[PDB]
RNA sequence: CUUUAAUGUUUGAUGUUCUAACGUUGACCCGUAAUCCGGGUUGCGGACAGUGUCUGGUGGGUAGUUUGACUGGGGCGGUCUCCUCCUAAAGAGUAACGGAGGAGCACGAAGGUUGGCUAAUCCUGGUCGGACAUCAGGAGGUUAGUGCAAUGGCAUAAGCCAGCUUGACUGCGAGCGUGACGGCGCGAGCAGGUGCGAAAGCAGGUCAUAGUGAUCCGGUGGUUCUGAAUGGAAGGGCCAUC
RNA sequence: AAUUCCUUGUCGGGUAAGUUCCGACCUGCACGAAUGGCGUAAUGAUGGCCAGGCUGUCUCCACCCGAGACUCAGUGAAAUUGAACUCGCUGUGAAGAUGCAGUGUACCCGCGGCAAGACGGAAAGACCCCGUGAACCUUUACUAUAGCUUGACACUGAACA
RNA sequence: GUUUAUUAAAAACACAGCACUGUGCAAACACGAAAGUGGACGUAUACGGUGUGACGCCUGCCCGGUGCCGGAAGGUUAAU
RNA sequence: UGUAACGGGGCUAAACCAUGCACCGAAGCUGCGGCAGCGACGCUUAUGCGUUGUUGGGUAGGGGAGCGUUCUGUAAGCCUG
RNA sequence: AGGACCGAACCGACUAAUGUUGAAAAAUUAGCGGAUGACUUGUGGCUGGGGGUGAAAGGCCAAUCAAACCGGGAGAUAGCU
RNA sequence: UUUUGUAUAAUGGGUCAGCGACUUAUAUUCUGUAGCAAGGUUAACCGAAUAGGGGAGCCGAAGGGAAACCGAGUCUUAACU
RNA sequence: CCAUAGGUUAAUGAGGCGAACCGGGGGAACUGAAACAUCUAAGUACCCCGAGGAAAAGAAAUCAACCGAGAUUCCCCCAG
């Protein structure tokens, strides 16, 4: 980043924002990952056993990415709108 | 640079303010303009306060 | 001595010449005064900048009793 | 050893989807009563790093 | 409350005295065969001095360093950012310690709009009144005007008066100009709300181009966006601003 | 004037002739009274000037005595060095040529001499500039700091006013 | 008399003298984290520092600046 | 320093002007042969072979392809009194 | 009597010449100053590097001094050759 | 070698022989190549062991926003043509 | 005065050396920051003390997050 003695680009520009500690313990889930668990139920403890989200994660959303075919109970996790339509069309049952 | 700078506080209760300058030597009386307040989305009279 | 100064070149002039198709909003002439004047479908900016209000070809022409130079955008 | 991130540049840039970097504009921190509202309004949204100075950013931010 | 005493205790300030801390580079005794030292007796000093921590001053005694560049060599002198003209070779751009001038503001109207108006100079006539005030006519036709330098504009006036006013609006912005970049500039239109106008319309500061300062750090207001077990808070973020 | 720029000031002395010297003048660029002022006998491997004696200092060198140089025998270095079949001139050319062009001259090789050139040898110029080089040194540069000094608390108590 | 051993012996340093100033003795001062030691087994006719530099005649005016000394009423002012 | 202001010899044209035809003159161009690069095109590709155009001065620098050296495997092999 | 005088030893180093890959990393030759004093000399001791020591030249401190020598940080750093 | 430019009278080399300068480790990116492919891959360690185990992790298949949060969208804004 | 200090014996032990590793007491600067003072180099070099075959640390007044883990040391991650 040394530009001669000119004030460099990484110091001409201002700092912005902060880092959310809560963002480090959230995760996003494909619909293709819902079949990779066993038992057809999805909890936080089920996904960590399936090695999908990781141990320190405490919050998770399900996102329309990939596709699901088997009926899968989703329990205690946030679901987006397109993933809610895709889970319920394949036979799923989103609950808390 | 005798022309100091002030701020025009909204009288709509919001803390919204326009900032501007005035010559306090030649205009001792306070500046009051009716300006748009984007929080209330109305034109409200603003009054001069100190820039502080 | 006493003559070291000069200012930066403001890069005025005519940016799009005649018969040259432009988009709406394209700057045609930058200038100090109204050395040129705004004709049909051409706006005059705050600093007397002439920009195109519509799309089409640039037409330079001299009109009026004072023989002033007007810039218009022909339809296309 | 690992490369160390220039930690000042990590506070100024964020990598976007196609690999470009967004950043806050300058000139919007102090001395604001003399600037036009049109000028400031075009400085609030984040802008992309231009193609010329994009090489120096990647050298400062090796871990994306 | 205005106007001040009593009683007692509530601890400081300065005398005032003492001995028991402490000092003794006073005398004497012993360890001892010893001008060190330690112990003992005694005298003098005495809560002072003197040391520790904290603290203000002083501090080239000592230490670490800084002390710009351009430059028809260096120093001396001048210069360093920004605007205008020429050099600039009829697009843009274009250097020199080339030729000439300015800026570091101002304005709550000198902004917006509607309505209206048109200069400089000279000639003649006219109380004070004169080279030159004001008045009336004529020539003249912008040789004037523009808050300020120069250049380009300016009569539909952008020049000059008056009325009403705050668009010197907030969110945006197709598309271009200009830069290596940071950035700077122009912008129809859209959403909201507004001013003037009967209306068409015009208004996102001023005839345009100078009137300026990155980031960091910090201040102020706003905003639950964040809040390290949890609820708050601190702090941070974002918006405005210094 | 150990100080005077102008300056070789002017005047006087000394000399045939004196930018120095000596004595005056004062117009002290820019003397001056313990960073002492002005004198001053004696002293000085001290500075300037003058005279006598003396002389190869010189006019202007001559000869002589020895030590080298020179020759023979013995021993036997050194600095330097891209390579050499290593001329002059005028011109040219990284702008002062043994090497280029034109031209002139010149049989091959020593020895004793001289030092004009080989931008000769020796020392990565000390001068000058440069480096965001170094070192010491200075101060009312900056920031510290030993030291000195101030007060609070502690070691530290008792009475009385 | 001294001095740049190895380009400078001098008008430089030193010097006797003179003056200013500090210093009452566990002296000032100096070397030492300190203990100590030097000053000095000395005691203001002594010791340290500074300037001047035999001797002769002398040494004028200025305390605004910068230091130093003395002052303690007021202003300002640290830890606490 | 030496002619030393055509390169010299020399020249009254072997100078100058005009016109004309010759010739000389370079690593330019053509001929003949050889190598290579990059494009075309086709092949019947051995993943490159004919033909075909065209290219081939080069520092800094970028790209492509190699030679040789020592050591290890191949190698208790092969060469060698 | 004398930091008295002249002058050898002894101590010093004013001038010239030589020498300058020397006889010599400061000397020789001819002169020169001091030579009873603040003299000179033998032996032994003590003072240590931001320190000593200095009749003061930034002199001397083992042929080295505007901060000795040796070892270490150490392959300091060198936008320079 | 350095240069705008050197026969340069600019630098360097007396000669020969030997030695003498772009490496190594770890990160990271790109290109080539190979393995597998919406997955790829293990690190310590175990293991008698260049095997096999080990999937802790890391990278990728989703992004936007300062952030909560939303999600093939999201942010901006009262709301976006 | 007792006493104590001191004295004389006796017994046991220590002393010194050694490469690295270890714990502790002290502790730079060049350098980097394109200067430089905060900072960096780095608790590094060095000095000093003590120890052992290893030393050190070590059995929660520790984490965690409303679920739980269960001394110390070491390795790979977390993660530049
Ligand atoms: Mg700068
Ligand atoms: Mg996992
Ligand atoms: Mg802000
Ligand atoms: Mg200093
Ligand atoms: Mg330093
Ligand atoms: Mg310079
Ligand atoms: Mg100059
Ligand atoms: Mg032009
Ligand atoms: Mg042109
Ligand atoms: Mg105006
Ligand atoms: Mg009008
Ligand atoms: Mg106007
Ligand atoms: Mg204007
Ligand atoms: Mg800063
Ligand atoms: Mg909390
Ligand atoms: Mg909350
Ligand atoms: Mg807490
Ligand atoms: Mg004088
Ligand atoms: Mg003179
Ligand atoms: Mg004479
Ligand atoms: Mg005379
Ligand atoms: Mg003479
Ligand atoms: Mg005289
Ligand atoms: Mg004097
Ligand atoms: Mg005096
Ligand atoms: Mg004197
Ligand atoms: Mg012989
Ligand atoms: Mg020959
Ligand atoms: Mg020549
Ligand atoms: Mg000869
Ligand atoms: Mg010669
Ligand atoms: Mg000779
Ligand atoms: Mg010569
Ligand atoms: Mg030479
Ligand atoms: Mg040199
Ligand atoms: Mg003498
Ligand atoms: Mg000498
Ligand atoms: Mg001498
Ligand atoms: Mg004593
Ligand atoms: Mg003196
Ligand atoms: Mg006096
Ligand atoms: Mg005074
Ligand atoms: Mg006074
Ligand atoms: Mg005082
Ligand atoms: Mg001649
Ligand atoms: Mg002819
Ligand atoms: Mg050819
Ligand atoms: Mg051919
Ligand atoms: Mg060719
Ligand atoms: Mg080639
Ligand atoms: Mg082999
Ligand atoms: Mg004598
Ligand atoms: Mg001597
Ligand atoms: Mg002699
Ligand atoms: Mg004698
Ligand atoms: Mg000196
Ligand atoms: Mg020596
Ligand atoms: Mg030293
Ligand atoms: Mg030093
Ligand atoms: Mg180091
Ligand atoms: Mg080195
Ligand atoms: Mg070379
Ligand atoms: Mg050169
Ligand atoms: Mg040159
Ligand atoms: Mg040549
Ligand atoms: Mg030569
Ligand atoms: Mg050469
Ligand atoms: Mg050179
Ligand atoms: Mg050589
Ligand atoms: Mg790969
Ligand atoms: Mg692959
Ligand atoms: Mg440092
Ligand atoms: Mg540095
Ligand atoms: Mg242990
Ligand atoms: Mg529990």
Short mmCIF file of C-alpha atoms in Angstrom, two decimals, chain D residues 5-6 8 10-11 13 17-20 24-25 30 38 40-41 46-47 50-52 54-55 57-59 64:
data_model
loop_
_atom_site.label_atom_id
_atom_site.label_comp_id
_atom_site.label_asym_id
_atom_site.label_seq_id
_atom_site.Cartn_x
_atom_site.Cartn_y
_atom_site.Cartn_z
CA UNK D 5 -3.57 -8.42 7.19
CA UNK D 6 -3.02 -4.69 7.08
CA UNK D 8 -6.17 -0.51 8.90
CA UNK D 10 -9.55 -4.25 6.95
CA UNK D 11 -11.54 -1.43 8.57
CA UNK D 13 -12.89 -2.21 2.70
CA UNK D 17 -19.89 -10.77 -4.44
CA UNK D 18 -17.79 -10.67 -7.60
CA UNK D 19 -14.61 -9.84 -5.71
CA UNK D 20 -14.71 -6.07 -5.78
CA UNK D 24 -17.04 4.66 2.36
CA UNK D 25 -16.41 7.94 0.61
CA UNK D 30 -16.13 17.27 9.17
CA UNK D 38 -26.34 17.47 -3.46
CA UNK D 40 -23.15 15.05 0.46
CA UNK D 41 -26.05 12.94 -0.78
CA UNK D 46 -20.70 3.08 -0.48
CA UNK D 47 -18.70 2.98 -3.71
CA UNK D 50 -11.73 1.67 -8.99
CA UNK D 51 -9.74 -0.58 -11.30
CA UNK D 52 -6.49 1.35 -10.93
CA UNK D 54 -7.68 -2.26 -6.86
CA UNK D 55 -4.25 -3.89 -6.97
CA UNK D 57 -6.15 -3.27 -1.88
CA UNK D 58 -5.68 -6.99 -2.55
CA UNK D 59 -2.05 -6.76 -1.42
CA UNK D 64 -10.34 -11.48 1.55
#
